[PDB]
Paper text:
X-ray crystallographic analysis shows that both compounds bind to Mpro’s active-site cavity, forming a covalent bond with the catalytic amino acid Cys-145 with the 4-fluorine of the benzothiazole moiety pointed to solvent. Using the X-ray structures, we also examined the binding mode of TKB245 and TKB248 complexed with Mpro. Taken together, the structural data strongly suggest that the 4-fluorobenzothiazole moiety plays a crucial role in the potent activity of TKB245 and TKB248 against SARS-CoV-2 strains.
Moreover, when the 7-fluoro-4-methoxy-indole ring at P3 and carbamide at P2 of TKB198 were further replaced with trifluoroacetyl L-α-tert-butylglycine and “6,6-dimethyl-3-azabicyclohexane”, respectively, the resultant TKB245 achieved highly potent anti-SARS-CoV-2 activity with the EC50 and EC95 values of 0.03 and 0.53 µM, respectively, and its anti-Mpro-enzymatic activity was also improved with IC50 value of 0.007 µM. TKB245 was found to be active against all of such variants examined with EC50 values ranging 0.014 to 0.056 µM. The only difference in chemical composition is the substitution of sulfur (TKB248) with oxygen (TKB245) at the center part. Structures of both inhibitors exhibit identical binding mode within the binding pocket. In the present study, we found that TKB245 exerts more potent activity in inhibiting Mpro’s enzymatic activity than nirmatrelvir.
Numbering used by the authors:
A (entry chain A), B (entry chain A): 0 to 302
The structure:
């Protein structure tokens, strides 16, 4: 039936890795994997250091014992520290016994991941996000959420892809991979920064239309087809990402399952962009959803 | 900022309780708490028994050894079985060492909970749901999801409120509390059953409008107020639940935080119902959201 939900990965393998990192009066979250704790390097900042911190200079004045690391109620001993890009790596004398099989991945714009929102090292909530084309995410983060991570789970392996650092003025979020490199052009200082144009992830909207068809929501199917070049003219007007032949190939499984050629679905999407949804819903949404990948759709449609 | 997401509870405390229950050729999920496994009683049904099962008669032919219970790759020994309403309770010789502090609660229509969707005893995904006024939920469930549970977490205590049993023809879902009593008038047989009218949870839409204001999405605030009786005339036309003085009292914290009297917000809601959203969004939604309780809003707005 028409039941289709934004589903997050079960969070238990990540919950066991969240710790609290305190330096002076600043507390945020860290990720404890093996004998290393990862956290945003601005744990070392006071509120008169945020406008333009010199992180190398601020770190000169910090020693192992200035980093307080707490896993639940239990204190970790810090035996080494280093800065890698915008993350701090705290070497502790105890390997996390709850460390899962894991990898660090730098995800591509358009890919989705689960966020485990944490405050003071304690898990608060889990939700699904996408890396947007402008390298922001539409999260739900407050003061104290920094160091919360984004991940995907493939069988038993956790692929960590995001660490939370900041909120931009449109209310969207920016952060790093687990090597401390920002997604997008953002820097970890409190200066005027703005997200570029928020373009729609075309291949995901198409995947979600396939999901609607598989789930029996079929009203938007029309009698038309189109070409990649003509569809892509329409993509540009409505700030959709161009569709490529790689995107068409990636939609192959969904196309094969439904028997609907990708260019036929593109012609259905073209009409939805030009005419709107006339106050109808698709899988219970009144807007075109772009935060389900082709892989997410196949997963939620086939178990 | 305007970031507000359907957030689920972290699932780790529930993941450790999911097992697989097999009886003959039927496999579904069970919940392993202390030395008891809970699962839907139709684990004992074959596909020629679903139209009108006599569960008491079907259970006569079942012994402890006919219930296969697997936690991961590890077989549990069944030393007793009983039927309680629409659930089976399998006594096993091993207390689940991962059993969390927990309670069984029968939730009220309008209350929200997290679902951990499971297939073959393995967690697949987590998402937030509401018990709708017609005692259905708008889930994402396939074949094999039966026995998946709904829960809330308050600190360290897990309150189990839902076990999944069935899908109705509108694509919505029905199930039981953990004592095996259905929410609503549904029965565990494959017969013509239909959800009643799907009314909107008025107090939740109001809570979500307070969230929009707290998050700076303010365009829908107007210069008007109304009365409970006049608002409630409008509630009826649009299939909204009547608003009561208890609902007004429950919205007290959000009213106090924003300084917006509940009847002023009701007058804003009245105009949104009568005039629609004119293709605008509130917290990124093109429809009025009713699956955030006042408590959910306060939680996501205050950490
Ligand atoms: C995060 O939790 C952190 N909080 C602190 C802190 F209190 C002291 C020292 C270091 C850190 S990191 C927090 C999460 C934000 C808060 C609101 N919603 C969030 O997601 N991150 C920040 O406060 C972050 C840190 C400085 C300023 N930050 C911002 O997010 C600001 N944004 C920007 O300046 C902009 F993005 F450029 F617009 C802010 C506070 C939202 C205006 C730094 C970037 C180091
Ligand atoms: C659930 O996973 C179960 N599957 C089996 C099974 F394969 C064999 C024996 C027992 C069970 S319980 C499954 C979940 C459903 C499937 C589709 N989406 C879901 O959420 N539940 C059922 O198949 C359920 C069991 C019989 C028929 N069921 C229904 O959900 C049917 N619905 C109804 O008859 C209606 F609700 F009344 F409309 C169905 C299959 C969707 C048409 C019973 C109620 C015992």
């Amino acid at each position: 039936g028409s039941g289709f939900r934004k589903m997050a990965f079960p969070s238990g393998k990540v919950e066991g890795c969240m710790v609290q990192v305190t330096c002076g009066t600043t507390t945020l979250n860290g990720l404890w994997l093996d004998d290393v704790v990862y956290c945003p390097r601005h744990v070392i900042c006071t509120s008169e250091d945020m406008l333009n911190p010199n992180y190398e200079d601020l770190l000169i004045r910090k020693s192992n014992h200035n980093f307080l690391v707490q896993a639940g109620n239990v204190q970790l001993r810090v035996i080494g520290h280093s800065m890698q890009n915008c993350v701090l790596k705290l070497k502790v004398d105890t390997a996390n016994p709850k460390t899962p099989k894991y990898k660090f991945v730098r995800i591509q714009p358009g890919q989705t991941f689960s966020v485990l929102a944490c405050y003071n090292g304690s898990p608060s909530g889990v939700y699904q996000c996408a890396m947007r084309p402008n390298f922001t995410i539409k999260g739900s983060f407050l003061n104290g959420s920094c160091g919360s991570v984004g991940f995907n789970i493939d069988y038993d392996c956790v692929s960590f892809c995001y660490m939370h650092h900041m909120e931009l003025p449109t209310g969207v979020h920016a952060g790093t991979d687990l090597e401390g490199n920002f997604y997008g052009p953002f820097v970890d200082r409190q200066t005027a920064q703005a997200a570029g144009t928020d373009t729609t992830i075309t291949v995901n909207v198409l995947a979600w239309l396939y999901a609607a068809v598989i789930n029996g929501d079929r009203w938007f199917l029309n009698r038309f087809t189109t070409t990649l070049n003509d569809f892509n003219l329409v993509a540009m007007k409505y700030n959709y990402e161009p569709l490529t032949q790689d995107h068409v190939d990636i939609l192959g499984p969904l196309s094969a399952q439904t028997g609907i050629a990708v260019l036929d679905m593109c012609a259905s999407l073209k009409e939805l962009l030009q005419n709107g949804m006339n106050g109808r819903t698709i899988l219970g949404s009144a807007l075109l959803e772009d935060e389900f990948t082709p892989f997410d759709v196949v997963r939620q449609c086939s178990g």
